[PDB]
Amino acid sequence: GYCAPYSGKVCKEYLTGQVWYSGGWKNEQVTTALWDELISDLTGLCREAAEKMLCAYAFPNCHMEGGRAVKAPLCFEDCQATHLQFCYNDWVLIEEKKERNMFIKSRGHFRLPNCSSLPHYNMRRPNCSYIGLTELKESEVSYDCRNGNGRFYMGTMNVSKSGIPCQRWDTQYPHKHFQPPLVFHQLLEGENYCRNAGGEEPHPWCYTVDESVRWQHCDIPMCPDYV
Numbered sequence: 001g002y003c004a005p006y007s008g009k010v011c012k013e014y015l016t017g018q019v020w021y022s023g024g025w026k027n028e029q030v031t032t033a034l035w036d037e038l039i040s041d042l043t044g045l046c047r048e049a050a051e052k053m054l055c056a057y058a059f060p061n062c063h064m065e066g067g068r069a070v071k072a073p074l075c076f077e078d079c080q081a082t083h084l085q086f087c088y089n090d091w092v093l094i095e096e097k098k099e100r101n102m103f104i105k106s107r108g109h110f111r112l113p114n115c116s117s118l119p120h121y122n123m124r125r126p127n128c129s130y131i132g133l134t135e136l137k138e139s140e141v142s143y144d145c146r147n148g149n150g151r152f153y154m155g156t157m158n159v160s161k162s163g164i165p166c167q168r169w170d171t172q173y174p175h176k177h178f179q180p181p182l183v184f185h186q187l188l189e190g191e192n193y194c195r196n197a198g199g200e201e202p203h204p205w206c207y208t209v210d211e212s213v214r215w216q217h218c219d220i221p222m223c224p225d226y227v
């Protein structure tokens with residue numbers, strides 16, 4: 001229709017509400033070919049983010065505002081998480097190939113989004129096709145210990161394993177940084193606390209106040225009851 005359930009196959013597992021209509025087959029074709037060429041070449045947290053982002057890009061959520069059907073673009077925070085953290089390495093490698101006129105063969109009209117041009121999430125009806133990449137997994141959050149690599153460690157440990165004070169995430173001195181982006185919920189009020197918001201390190205970590213130690217893991221005990 002204008003707003004209707006997703007009628008395709010490739011994104012069946014990722015799309016749960018109404019999506020925008022009016023074409024729809026062209027986006028199914030392209031997404032299917034990209035699943036084979038691009039998605040299947042990705043791994044780990046990048047792959048997880050990319051699948052959700054690709055489906056939300058290709059089949060935007062739809063909602064009614066009075067009599068008008070509204071297409072919801074991607075969210076700034078999800079895009080930031082994907083571009084600057086989860087998929088940064090793969091994203092840079094694609095962009096560098098594009099500079100040499102080497103393109104993903106199956107991209108069709110699809111293009112990597114510019115995160116800065118997208119709405120910031122939140123509002124009973126969302127302004128974007130929110131996927132939640134920056135959110136905490138509540139059951140895995142911990143405070144006095146870490147579950148596994150501590151991706152969702154939210155404690156107040158504020159020195160590295162050798163005792164160096166952490167630099168604040170919201171400051172660019174002594175170490176300048178663009179990743180992890182501060183849209184991750186671990187970092188919104190991250191103070192100078194050890195964090196593993198990207199989930200790629202084996203331990204929570206921080207940039208340190210020592211000019212000669214850009215970043216270092218913190219030393220946090222495993223949670224007694226973590227398996």
Ligand SMILES: *[C@@H]1O[C@H](CO)[C@@H](O[C@@H]2O[C@H](CO)[C@@H](O)[C@H](O)[C@H]2NC(C)=O)[C@H](O)[C@H]1NC(C)=O
Pocket residue numbers: 114115116117
């Ligand atoms: C991605 O989008 C942002 C947001 O619009 C662009 O930032 C603008 O850049 C232009 C220069 O072309 C400036 O005149 C504007 O002041 C910027 N706007 C904002 C809101 O920051 C950015 O240039 C885009 N990135 C690319 C590579 O095109």
Ligand SMILES: CCCCCC/C=C/CCCCCCCC(=O)O
Pocket residue numbers: 034038050053054057082087090091094098103104107110111112113
């Ligand atoms: C590693 C990047 C994974 C994609 C991240 C989410 C982006 C979804 C939009 C679809 C982009 C499809 C590839 C387009 C390639 C290009 O810009 O030339």
